[PDB]
Swiss-Prot record, chain C:
GO cellular component: cytosol
Protein name, entry field: Listeriolysin regulatory protein
HTH crp-type domain sequence ranges: 136-202
Source organism, top-level taxon: Bacteria
Sorted UniProt keywords: Activator, DNA-binding, Transcription, Transcription regulation, Virulence
Gene Ontology molecular function: any one: DNA-binding transcription factor activity
Record's keyword annotation contains Isomerase: no
Its job: Positively regulates expression of listeriolysin, of 1-phosphadidylinositol phosphodiesterase (PI-PLC) and other virulence factors.
């Protein structure tokens, strides 16, 4: 959930 | 993500159907003149770019739920010619035409704020990664990488925190030698065909600004590991 | 810009008074718990952070008109512990709290699109930079660095393309030194009149391709005026 | 690094  | 569930419902109610995608498949590519808005509800993907010499550089990674846009919302021009490939064995995503997204968001301010805040998360992430890099060299970047990895897939264990992910997503010269240095210093250790955390403190220290970014942008997930 | 001037008049129509700032003044500091949405109109500013040791880490630079925000618009929570330090002798900005903004954009969606597209520009800009870096090292980093500055401050003169910006701010390291050394030698740039000149723009385009493409896509007019 |  979000950027990696 | 509670916001993402409401966004899913709001997209489906307006006749936007979920789409499935397999590994190595592109949701949108470089030369596509149609600008989109991908709501990656589930799955992992990477934003890459092919250079004129055929070399493919990986630029960003995204994990559901998240929003990735291929053009500007009003003028519908391209923001950048990029490709969005799938790195997870399977992924689910909603593909919206840029004009359709303009309409839908003009019909509802809450989801407008949602996509706007995803963009803000991107900006603050870039700033944090840049801070960690400019400070702790190229070590800060990989430290922030491992840090967010542990935070998103960390599972508590007596030996230490662990990321539950297939070896493929884990793997995906000098950087490898730095990994060797860290493994020898035993910041994390590999056992039972999996990567196992040992001391999350090293990463937080050498990737500080990204730790701040994740604390204030994903406080719920950040808390359980702290 | 035109859209920026329209947004300026809108903010002034809703009681937002423009405030002046002298160099080094902090428009907002990392400790201020209030989440703002600074619409820099005139001047130049820098977004900075400060690590434990107290060192100042210059994170980014912005030149009005542009938008900067200290909190997420959905949750109104802060986006980071940042400081917006002005660097022009006298700048003019419009400071607004987060909720006042949100309602302004809720009633007028055109300016909502304006700021939305601003943030899209910023993200794709970071992406193009990182791409040029990944594909051509610090050479491409430096090439894109001075490419954007010659695009925004390019004046086609008989001596090439003069860089129309204050030399003092221009001044504002062995690898970069060697790189700019070969740039000066190869003629792509020249230090005539102590003002940075550029005569081979194609060389900058080659090794900073993604930034050039970003400038074309986000700023097509200013990009075309020098091609 | 970069004047946006």
């Amino acid at each position: 959930r979000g950027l990696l | 993500n509670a916001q993402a569930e409401e966004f899913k419902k709001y997209l489906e109610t307006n006749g936007i159907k979920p789409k499935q995608f397999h590994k190595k498949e592109l949701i949108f590519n470089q030369w596509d003149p149609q600008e989109y808005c991908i709501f990656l509800y589930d799955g992992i993907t990477k934003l890459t770019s092919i250079s004129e010499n055929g070399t493919i550089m990986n630029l960003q990674y995204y994990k559901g739920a998240f929003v990735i846009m291929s053009g500007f919302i009003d003028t519908e021009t391209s923001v950048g010619y990029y490709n969005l490939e799938v790195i997870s064995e399977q992924a689910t995503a909603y593909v919206i035409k840029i004009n359709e997204l303009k309409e839908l968001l003009s019909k509802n301010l809450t989801h407008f704020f949602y996509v706007f805040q995803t963009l803000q998360k991107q900006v603050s992430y870039s700033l944090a990664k840049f801070n960690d890099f400019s400070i702790n060299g190229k070590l800060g970047s990989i430290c922030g990488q491992l840090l967010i990895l542990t935070y998103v897939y960390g599972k508590e264990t007596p030996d230490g925190i662990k990321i539950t992910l297939d070896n493929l997503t884990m793997q995906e010269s000098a950087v490898s030698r730095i990994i060797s240095k860290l493994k020898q210093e035993k910041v994390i250790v590999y056992k039972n065909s999996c990567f196992y955390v040992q001391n999350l403190d090293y990463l937080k220290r050498y990737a500080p600004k990204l730790d701040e970014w994740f604390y204030l942008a994903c406080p719920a997930t950040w808390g359980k590991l702290n």
